[PDB]
Amino acid sequence: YDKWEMERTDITMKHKLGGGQYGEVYEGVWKKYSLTVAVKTLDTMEVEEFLKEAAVMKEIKHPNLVQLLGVCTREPPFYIITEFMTYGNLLDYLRECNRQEVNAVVLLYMATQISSAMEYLEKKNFIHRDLAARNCLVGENHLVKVADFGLSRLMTGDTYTAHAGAKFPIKWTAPESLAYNKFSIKSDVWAFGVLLWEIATYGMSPYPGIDLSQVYELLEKDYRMERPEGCPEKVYELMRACWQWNPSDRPSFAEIHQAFETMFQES
Ligand SMILES: *N1=[C][C]=C2[C]=C(O[C])C(C3=[C]C4=C([C]=[C]3)N=C([N]C(=O)[N][C][C]=O)S4)=[C]C2=[C]1
Numbered sequence: 001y002d003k004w005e006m007e008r009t010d011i012t013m014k015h016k017l018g019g020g021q022y023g024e025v026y027e028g029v030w031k032k033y034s035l036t037v038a039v040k041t042l043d044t045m046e047v048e049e050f051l052k053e054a055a056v057m058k059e060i061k062h063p064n065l066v067q068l069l070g071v072c073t074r075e076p077p078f079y080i081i082t083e084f085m086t087y088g089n090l091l092d093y094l095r096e097c098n099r100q101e102v103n104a105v106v107l108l109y110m111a112t113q114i115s116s117a118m119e120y121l122e123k124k125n126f127i128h129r130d131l132a133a134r135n136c137l138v139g140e141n142h143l144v145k146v147a148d149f150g151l152s153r154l155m156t157g158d159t160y161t162a163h164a165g166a167k168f169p170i171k172w173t174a175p176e177s178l179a180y181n182k183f184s185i186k187s188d189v190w191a192f193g194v195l196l197w198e199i200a201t202y203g204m205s206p207y208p209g210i211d212l213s214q215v216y217e218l219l220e221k222d223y224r225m226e227r228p229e230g231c232p233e234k235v236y237e238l239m240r241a242c243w244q245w246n247p248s249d250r251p252s253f254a255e256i257h258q259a260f261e262t263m264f265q266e267s
Pocket of ligand 1: 017086089136137
């Protein structure tokens with residue numbers, strides 16, 4: 001709390017990041033260290049929600065989770081200051097990358113990193129609820145960090161019920177969430193599967209061409225996305241395992257990370 005607090009004049013604001021895709025996030029400079037930082041500023045979302053986002057993040061410490069640096073929560077406008085990522089989101093990164101550099105073993109390394117962060121959150125009784133390539137960020141040397149700004153506290157055996165009339169990213173959303181607004185860590189496992197598919201396709205859109213209003217119906221009848229071009233069968237089986245209808249049948253992130261660790265060590 002107090003140790004995280006810093007004065008607003010320690011930061012110089014530059015231009016907005018991502019053209020508003022991340023919301024009110026600006027590139028900033030922490031003058032004292034001459035360090036480029038990311039500053040979330042607050043219309044927009046509610047104040048207490050904003051403040052809780054900051055409160056949760058200072059409990060979070062993992063090499064593959066975006067790190068909180070400080071906060072300005074004494075006088076408006078409120079600031080949340082996090083580390084700045086060199087390249088931006090994983091989706092645009094994969095679409096624009098050199099695939100000879102970002103090859104099969106790099107993809108595996110990226111999945112291992114993301115699954116490592118989710119294994120951590122799983123242990124710390126958190127859920128993400130928006131795991132996707134657009135919410136992963138990339139630093140140099142194929143470093144990947146999961147954005148952890150919308151984390152919810154949830155015990156491992158419990159269920160989060162989203163508010164009435166909530167809008168979901170349908171093509172990343174688990175069937176129990178689409179139908180009953182229920183979220184759990186197994187729901188993040190589903191989203192991870194789709195995130196894997198994004199990575200294996202270098203940023204293709206999920207269920208391409210398929211009408212959003214029929215996605216749930218397709219899932220009911222056990223339709224699943226095809227094995228991507230050049231995707232290892234073992235990796236695709238992990239994807240299919242993530243997309244099991246019964247959430248309790250889906251793998252934990254501990255098992256997912258272990259499987260990816262093995263593959264990354266054997267290539
Ligand atoms: N508050 C709430 C939500 C946030 C989401 C989010 O991204 C998912 C960020 C964020 C965005 C970016 C960061 C760091 C954190 N670094 C970037 N680098 C970049 O774009 N490089 C290319 C050009 O400079 S983008 C913050 C959020 C805060």
